[PDB]
Amino acid sequence: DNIQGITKPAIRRLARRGGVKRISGLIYEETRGVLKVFLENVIRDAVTYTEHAKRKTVTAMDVVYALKRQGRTLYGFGG
């Protein structure tokens, strides 16, 4: 149940970077939900790239190729 390892104050941090001044308590859960959905949707594809390469270890590139697929392109990990 690692989703709670995303601590209220760490989300607080993320929203502070997002320029948020004030944060309803309901949010923290909502966020965890969205994060799960995100990581799910990404990793699924990321793993699916691994499974195609017949590897049992996920590469940085596997992640990048996926994030690129989900229109969320990431620089600084090659590709």
């Binding site: 970077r17 997002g18 320029g19 001044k21 994030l67 229109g71 969320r72 392109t73 990431l74 620089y75 600084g76 990990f77």
Partner: protein, 103 residues
């Protein structure tokens, strides 16, 4: 070297190879890789220029990620180009919507 004929640093040879091997088309006009290599070089430059400035303003000799972000996001055009692009250790441009400020 073809690069030294076109007056470029970027590798016109390597480009030409990548294009054939890249499954873009059967045949590749020997002019293309030159043209492309130059564009890439120009853009590479156009960024590093702005980044190099951002580095100076922070009193730093070395460009780190944040500098690239700070440069790209402040230039209207580069931004629009790198719209759906996340920059590792980028951070965000300090921006606090007015209605959040006090008094």
């Amino acid at each position: 070297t073809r690069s030294s004929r076109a007056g470029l640093q970027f590798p016109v040879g390597r480009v030409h190879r990548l294009l054939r091997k890249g499954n873009y088309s059967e045949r590749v006009g020997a002019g293309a890789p030159v043209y492309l290599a130059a564009v890439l070089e120009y853009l590479t430059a156009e960024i590093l220029e702005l980044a190099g400035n951002a580095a100076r303003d922070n009193k730093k000799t070395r460009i780190i990620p944040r500098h690239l972000q700070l440069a790209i996001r402040n230039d209207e055009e580069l931004n629009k180009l790198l719209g759906r692009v996340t920059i590792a250790q980028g951070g965000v441009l300090p921006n606090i919507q007015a209605v959040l400020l006090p008094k």
